Every structure is written in structure tokens, then in C-alpha cells.
Amino acid sequence: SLLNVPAGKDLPEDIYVVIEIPANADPIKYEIDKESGALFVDRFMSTAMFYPCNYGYINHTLSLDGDPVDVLVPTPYPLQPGSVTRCRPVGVLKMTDEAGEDAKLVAVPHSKLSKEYDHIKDVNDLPELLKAQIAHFFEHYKDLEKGKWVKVEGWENAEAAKAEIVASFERAKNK
Amino acid sequence: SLLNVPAGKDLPEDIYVVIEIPANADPIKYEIDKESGALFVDRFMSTAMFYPCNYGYINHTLSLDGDPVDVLVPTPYPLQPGSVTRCRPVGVLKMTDEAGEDAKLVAVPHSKLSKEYDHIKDVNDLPELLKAQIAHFFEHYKDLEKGKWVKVEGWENAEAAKAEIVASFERAKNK
Amino acid sequence: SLLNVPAGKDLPEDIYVVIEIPANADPIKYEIDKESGALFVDRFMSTAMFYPCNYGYINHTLSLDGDPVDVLVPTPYPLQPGSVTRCRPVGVLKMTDEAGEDAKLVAVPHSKLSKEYDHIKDVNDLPELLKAQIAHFFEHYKDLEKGKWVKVEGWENAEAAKAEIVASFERAKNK
Amino acid sequence: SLLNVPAGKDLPEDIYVVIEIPANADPIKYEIDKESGALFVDRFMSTAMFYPCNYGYINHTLSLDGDPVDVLVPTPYPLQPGSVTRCRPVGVLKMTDEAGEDAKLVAVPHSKLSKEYDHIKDVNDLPELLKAQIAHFFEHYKDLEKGKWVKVEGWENAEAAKAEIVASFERAKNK
Amino acid sequence: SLLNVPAGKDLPEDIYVVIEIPANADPIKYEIDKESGALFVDRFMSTAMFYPCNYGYINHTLSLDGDPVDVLVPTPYPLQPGSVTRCRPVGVLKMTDEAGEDAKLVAVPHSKLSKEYDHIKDVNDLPELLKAQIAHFFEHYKDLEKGKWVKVEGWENAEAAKAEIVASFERAKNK
């Protein structure tokens, strides 16, 4: 049913993100099982860190690494895992890990759900604190994870973000 | 799967309500997408208000306004969004908005889930504080919402509530 | 979709548990409806007690009592109702109620989600406090429930636990 | 400073209760240290039970058992440990333990803080569910506690409650 | 001890606010008792509203209305009632009620506790959403309160805010 959900209304400008992990939650990392569509516990994280933003993916996309693009979505309040939020891509956090290339997009709630992020149009528009903190989380989160590692490659603009969306959508399609 | 869920066991006396928003939660308003059945964020509310009761709808119903009846269900404890609770209708809060007529029913957990609300048989049986507070929420919640408004038209009995249930069920059916 | 979920990867050693009720939650007892697969409120508990562990079941199993085996899964952090966790059976709490025989298994997160419970291989490996507390909960939880009762019959090893899993799986299958 | 706090405005009708443990909290039992006035952890409870109401005491009182009277105060919402609430006594739960006689009073927020409990004038006015549940908690809470036990002796009216308040106040005074 | 706390390091530019009510909490309104210094429940609010910011006061100040100035302090995270936060005044919300004149200041965490609010220097620097929402809360919060009312008189700058601080400090002093 969650596997039924669109990529967006008007890709890559207007997309839907399926939330897997809420902002500020306990460090349980969940994932939607592509087969059933149910939320599965992937791992209990060992580090005393929490996701700075709601974390999820854009359905009907296949990124370079085998998986749908992953998106981080700031909100006034934490969202329920498994809920879909309409968003608008604004930047990318480039990082390579041991999968190879695992960019995380940054998307802000679309303006129809709230006007609070209307001024956030590109990656420099986002608070520096927050960017520092996302980078920082991704750099350290798998610290205590034996066979897992991340090189935080840097930040990219909304155009690069939107290129990734299209490219991944296409990658999954036929057309 | 949630779109599979019945209206009730024995409509309008015994109904099932699909919970969209929990009592006392952060002001995120979710909704079940009729197409996929997943929970979607509709809007981040701007007012510093919270739903006094769990909020949801009765599936397989079509109210006047295009949507299933909406129900408010008091409980000892907040329920998870997307869960179904068996209830018994006891009153209605009449209000017209810019959709036209948007009555909210008030339903209490059926007696098989708890005996705590057995004495609540009709609308006057409900605490005055609570009624004041629901009315009050509905009157003000979209205050900061540009193109949205509500005239809280008053309270109605369980018979009026049950008439709405039947009428909406029928409206959606064929028969 | 949740009714689609497997029993396990490699039954009875490696199973999946579908979580209905989180550890430490408010005393709302939910259940997955076999027909729709949605989470339904079963009862508001009257006692001022909370489940010591996440509570759930193993799909595609039919226990003696008509239902799938029920499993209690300790975790660092409470899990979301409706999520699946991979586990490894380690003991059983035997108890008969007014259904007849309602053993609850005890399963620990598999080692791929966390190494924290690697040392927990059998029932004596589990903290005494916790065992006392599960027994204790099951003994008293339906105290204020008119037509419901439990005789906590005692604890059993992982072999007995795994026998139950197989036996219930088989019971549900054909083969 | 908390040891400075009065017994009440107009004892025994109008009293102040110093809250030690909130309603519904994790099972940590705190206590105010008479010497410093700070909140001290007394014990981590082993049972999977939670206090049904905010729990505290009336300062400047000496009960039979060596301690100030203990009061249970229902509220719409859980209170912070160490805060004082103005209340009005309405009933008593008689029970003897291994201290000897440890009645717990039941007090409702005074009407100046809320009108919600104005109808609660005597012990029969209180919900049956709640009374069952307090009795029930007190009966079982120290179950797993080696050298601790309770015989829940039954419920008493507001007059008996108010007699205890006066008697304990006097017991502590001179006059 | 809380009655011992200074007004600020360097009044009115650098002040300390004693937090009475946290941001986003349940609608319990607490207050520090000037006599003991303990936190007292003042009222259970009847409206389904929550304070948008942490709410408190500046000690050693006497406002026009008989009380210390009241301050609203935004923070990344809710603060504990009774804790002191160092802040910097940036604006005022003028409103008259039935006390007569009850301005609420708006203060941001000082830069030594966080750099997140360094850009917030004056009242226009604060998000519009937030200002709308504070105004909005103050306008409606005592709606269901019989003998209580508020006319939200409008917003003022940091200079007006700082004038109030000095003036109130002086009012309480001698010198």
C-alpha cells in the first residue's frame, strides 16, 4: 500500500517521501520491506546519536547504490514512521560509504502543508547549525559498527538534488 | 487494508473508527489516502492547539461534504494513528465551514474494550468541560489558516448522530 | 501486507515477530486483524500495569489456543506497533488461562540487529528480575477483568520454545 | 523550601500536597528528604506497574507510621515531582503494611485550579474503575519486594480522611 | 534558592529567566511561590492549547501588574520547569487583560548557550509564524475562563522590551 505510493505529484519539484525514521527518535533504524511493505527493524544503533531530521525515501526510485533515494525532511514536529509527506528538494549531502555512493537529499515540507519553509529554496538557505549536524551524524553514526563506514563528501545544491531524483526515477522506470 | 475495514459490526449502534490523529498529539494533521491507504501529512497546523480527542473516520461512508463521517473518540490513553477502535455514537457537533457542512460525531469506546464509558449514552452524558473544549478547538484551530473557516453550529444528540451514520453509509453504498 | 510477512528466515532458530504492543506503553492492548491486517484496539486494560517487553506474534503459526504463538521481545528501545523484528527464541513462559494453554515465548533480537543479546542463548541467560517481572505481569494483568484468568505455569528452555514454533507452523501449514 | 510549605490554607478542607511521584510515570519511587528538601530516589520498583495518580504528602503532618499523610491526586495531566497542588480530601484507602497502618488519602484538585472535580465530594463520587485500580496497585506493587507487604484494608469517606489530616497535623504540632 | 537568583548578568541586555512552564507541555500552568520558592500548580487550563515557548519570569523585577516581567523563550528543546536560562530580550507582546497591562517579553537564549539565535536581534527578526502563534495563544488561552480576558495590544521592539526590564528592576529595588 506504501509500495503503491507515487514518487511525486510533479517530479522532481514536488515529491512524496515515505518516512521510515522520525526526527529525534530512539536510535532504532527501521526500513520498509519492499516485499510486504511493512516496517522492519534493521538495527539497533550502538551510538548515543539520533537522526536530526525525519528520514525516508522516494518510492519508485533506484539510486546508484541499489536503493531508492533517501531523504531527510525537517518538520516542526516528528512524523510517524510509515507516513508520507509532500516535499520539495533543496540540497544534497554527498558521501560515499561501503555501498559506494550514498547521497542523502534534503527536502522541505511542500508549501501546501506549511509556509514555514517557503524561504528555503536552496542549500545555503538551510540553517548552518542543521547542516553541520546532519553532516556530523552521517560522519559518526556507524562508528561502533564493525563493517560499516562513511566519508562525508560535502553538500550540493537543489539542481544536483533534482538531477538525482529524475535520474533515479528513470533508472527504476522503463521509459 | 485500512480501506478494507468495515463501517461497523452493527451500524449505527456499533461502528469502527479508523484513527488518523491521536488525542493530545503534536499538531500534525494526517489523513488516510483513499488510493493507497497510507497515512499522509495534510498540514502542519500553525496554532498552538491540540486535538482534545483521537480523531478519525468511519470507512465506507460518504458525508455531505464529500468525505466519510469524522469521529472524535475519547479514551483513557492516546491511540496510534492508523488503528481501528470499536465505538458507539453518542452526539454530534454541528458546524459549517467552507466545505459547507462538517459535523463531527462523538463516539465512545464500545463496552467490550472498557466499561469506563458505559454511562455515556447521550450527548448530555459527556462532561461539559470536554464539550466546551471540542467546540472551542473546532472554532479556533484554523485561525491562522488563510482560506479556511468554521462556524460551530452547536451540539446534537445520539439519534441525530446515528441518522448521519446511516445516511452516509447509504450514500456510499448502492442499496 | 503484515499478513504477508513470513514466520522466519530459518524457523525456529531465526524468526520474525510482528509487534502489536510496545514495551512500556500505555495499557492499550492492540491486535492485528487477520482479515484486513490493520491494528485494532482490543481493550483498554483496567490495571495500572505495563507490558515489560514488546509483545507480538509469529505469522503463519497456529498455536494450541487458536492463535499464532505470542512472543515477548526485549529491546534497548520500544518498538512501533506493526513493525517486524528479526529474533531468536530463548525460553517459554507456560501458563494456562481460560482459553486453555497460552504459553508466551521469549525472543531476543537476532544478532544482525544488535550484539547486545548474543550471550542470551537459553532461558537462564535472561535476567532474573525480568523473568520475575514478566511472570508477574501475566499473573496479574487481567485481575480487574471479570471473565479472564491466568495460572502462570512456569518457565521453559529454548528447545521447548523452538518445538512450539515448529509445531505451530506445521499446524497452520498443510505439509 | 519545600520543607517550608504549609499543610494547607484551611485544614483539612483545603490542603496543599507536595507531589513526589507523577501519575503514569516510570516506576521510580522518589521521596523528599526532610533534611535537605531535595528529591531522592528511594527505589527502582521491580513490578511492571505505574502509579495511577500523582502521589505525594501533606507537609507538617505526622501520620501514625512516622511519616506525613500520603495523598493520591488525580489530574487531567501528570504533574512535576516537587510541585505543590492545592486539593480537597475526599476519601481514604485503608491498608496496613509492615510499618503497621498506612492509609493513603485521595484528594482532588481544589476548584480554583479546575472545575472538573467539583462533583467529587465524597468517596463514592470517584469512578469505580479508578478506585479498583488504586486498591489494585497498592495490593500488588511491592510483590517482588522481599521484605515488604500490604493488606488493603478497604475504603473510607471524606470525614474519616479529614479526621486523619487534623489528627496528623496535631500530632506534628505542639498545640 | 530560586528566589536567590539574579535578574541578570548585565541588565537589560543579559538577563536570566526562571522557567515556570516548558514549551509544548500539557496545559498545566505552574508558578513559583515567592514565599517558599517551590513550583505550585495555579490552574489546569480548559482549552486544548499549549504554550508555544518556554514561559517564565525575571526575578527581582516588579512589573506594572504586581508581578515580575514574564518572558517567553524559544529553544531547540523544552526546558525543565524551575531551571534558569540566560537570555537576551528582543521584543514585547503588549496586551492588557483584567489585571490591566500584561506585556510578555520575548527573549532568546544568550549566544554563550547556543549560536542558533544570534541573528535574532529585534522583533522583526523572529519568525512571523511564531509571532502569529504567540499572539494567537495569548488571545485565546483563557477563553473558557469565566473571569479572565485579554486584548492583545500588538508587538514592540527590543528597546521597548529593555525599557520594561530596567523600569521593573528599578521598581523592585530602592536605588
Next chain:
Amino acid sequence: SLLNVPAGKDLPEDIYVVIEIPANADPIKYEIDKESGALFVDRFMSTAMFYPCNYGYINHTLSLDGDPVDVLVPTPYPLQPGSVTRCRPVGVLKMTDEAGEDAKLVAVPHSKLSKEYDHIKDVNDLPELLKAQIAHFFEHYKDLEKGKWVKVEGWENAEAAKAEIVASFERAKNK
């Protein structure tokens, strides 16, 4: 009042720790002000990390760095900031920062509050996960803090821990 609190019952074996920051809380770092004894916000942390254990200090102690020893206390449940817990020292985490030498002790609830940590007698008795995670937190927590840094120097036994307690007590005394 909190400045009145003893170091312990029977130093260094049996000590009291005054809790400043709870386990798993939002990343607000509080501190008790030696002058008033009230809890003060020190800093909003910028990293998306949370204290793995309740964090506090032993009153009437002066460590090398100018401050009382700091203690980390695991508990079943998070404690309230400002509450005192009786503990028993079991290990030390040596680390030097830009203060110079800032060892953090590790103390477990005394056995009179719970038997759950009776087996924890020395530093190797503590879970490896937890030790990894404390080390890990201390190593990274001030990452985004300009003028602050930590070299996690390693772990030490209970004897070294108890030597620190005595030495710091003495340092503060006269005798």
C-alpha cells in the same frame, strides 16, 4: 538545599550523586549553580547525540579541574534532573580536555534501591556496548563546539574511581 546534600553515607563505597542531566534526554546540558543551588542551562548542544546515562556530580568534592567529580549512573529509567541517587562507584573513564583532566566516574545504583546491578562490582562487569558508547559520546559530543575538545584517555577500575572520590572529598574539606 541541593548544596546541603552529603557526598555519601560511607565514602567512597556509598555515595550520593546529584543528577543534572537524565539518560536519553534532549541535548540540553544543565548544571546546578553553586550559589543558588538552582538548575541552570549551560548550553544547547549542537550535535545530534544524547547522554547514554544520567549524568551528575558528588557534592562536597573538588576534582582536579575545579569541579566536583562527575558521575554517570545507569538506571532502568531516566531520572529527574535535580534528584539524588544513592550509588556505588565501579570504574572511571579517563580523558583530558581543555580544562586538563576530566575523568568521569561510573556509578551504579546502590543495592538498596534495586538488585539489578549487584553483579556490577568492577569496570569489566559493565556491558561492553555501554562502555563503548560512553567513550564514544565523550569523544564526539563537543565536536561542533569551537573552543572545546576531548582526548578519551581510557578506562579504570573501581579502586582508581574510589581513590578519586576520597582525594576530591579531601581536597574540598580541611581535614
